[PDB]
């Protein structure tokens with residue numbers, strides 16, 4: 001029995017979720033050439049409105065954030081209007097939805113933004129080329145200046161302002177999976193020697209400035225944050241990263257966020273540096289609402305939540321394979337297994 005997945009969950013005084021099931025953020029690369037959400041995307045999200053909360057696909061805050069084709073933005077008026085169609089449709093279906101605010105940092109590619117500079121904490125290139133594209137090899141980033149950083153914080157904040165007009169219920173800040181914010185939090189990517197590098201406090205500074213700037217626009221009850229304390233996605237490991245997160249997590253708790261959400265693909269994986277799984281590490285260092293994710297079945301998620309491992313379950317791939325995931329779980333019906341080939345279709 002997975003009855004607990006259907007518990008009401010009060011995130012805070014502003015938002016109550018009708019169940020504990022989140023749609024995980026899932027990049028689909030289906031926005032139009034102006035990175036405006038399409039009417040097909042409207043229908044796609046609308047049919048998943050039985051989720052307690054949808055986290056949108058990663059949505060770029062400005063042009064030099066783009067690293068994959070046709071990933072939507074939230075920085076132009078047309079993009080805002082396109083997202084308003086999405087959020088209106090989700091709300092009309094009785095759902096709720098947060099936008100996931102993205103900057104890819106060193107994982108951006110200048111093909112998408114007129115040959116401009118890729119930005120990151122340090123001039124540390126990742127290996128390889130953009131997946132599913134022809135020959136877009138990653139480039140050495142420019143190490144951001146403090147002025148670049150001020151502009152990036154400003155643009156995260158402006159993107160958050162824009163979510164009001166776009167009609168989202170809130171923002172998940174994408175601080176995970178090797179992207180810009182996570183790049184400041186890990187030694188592989190952050191080799192800085194200024195006030196944004198070196199020590200846990202300094203390496204956490206960018207993340208906290210972005211969190212605080214966004215709270216100043218939309219409020220703590222509408223702000224969540226995804227983190228990846230375990231390096232796995234465009235990030236080499238470093239044994240010193242754990243103490244960065246040991247500092248960051250209690251600082252985050254002071255902000256009384258809507259949630260922290262783990263970014264991982266299989267949370268059954270143990271990280272030596274974290275003393276175990278990513279979720280168990282965070283749960284041991286953070287005492288507010290936690291969203292688990294990564295290769296959970298409804299059954300294993302339900303058990304984890306019953307065992308106080310985390311509070312809410314995000315479901316990714318099964319929500320692609322099963323638009324009616326929530327109803328099928330509710331009714332104990334067969335679920336289709338995900339395959340990567342399903343990404344070809346937006347259903």
Ligand SMILES: Cc1cc2nc3c(=O)[nH]c(=O)nc-3n(C[C@H](O)[C@H](O)[C@H](O)COP(=O)(O)O)c2cc1C
Nearest residue numbers: 024025026027057058264265293294295315316317
């Ligand atoms: C096709 C695909 C795209 C994804 N896009 C994002 C993304 O936009 N933002 C993000 O934070 N995670 C992204 N993820 C990771 C998922 O949110 C999730 O953490 C992962 O799929 C594990 O959960 P699952 O086992 O339920 O699928 C993506 C995963 C997949 C498979």
Ligand SMILES: CCCCCCCCCCCCCCCCCC
Nearest residue numbers: 230231232233234265269270271340
């Ligand atoms: C878009 C569909 C599939 C996406 C590709 C996979 C992305 C996640 C895996 C990346 C690297 C994982 C290897 C983990 C190393 C460290 C584990 C302790």
Ligand SMILES: O=Cc1ccc(O)cc1
Nearest residue numbers: 061062063075076077155
């Ligand atoms: O470069 C950032 C940017 C922000 C808002 C826009 O409308 C266009 C670009």
Ligand SMILES: O=Cc1ccc(O)cc1
Nearest residue numbers: 129130131132133134340
């Ligand atoms: O470049 C195509 C590609 C597809 C799936 C992957 O997992 C990796 C790369």
Ligand SMILES: O=Cc1ccc(O)cc1
Nearest residue numbers: 163164168169170218222
């Ligand atoms: O963060 C989104 C938001 C939406 C409606 C509001 O009234 C305030 C904030």
Ligand SMILES: O=Cc1ccc(O)cc1
Nearest residue numbers: 027058068176177179263
């Ligand atoms: O596959 C695309 C992808 C984008 C953002 C993520 O965080 C993870 C995966």
Ligand SMILES: O=Cc1ccc(O)cc1
Nearest residue numbers: 339341342343344345346
């Ligand atoms: O939408 C494409 C698709 C591909 C393979 C499947 O098994 C199901 C759907």
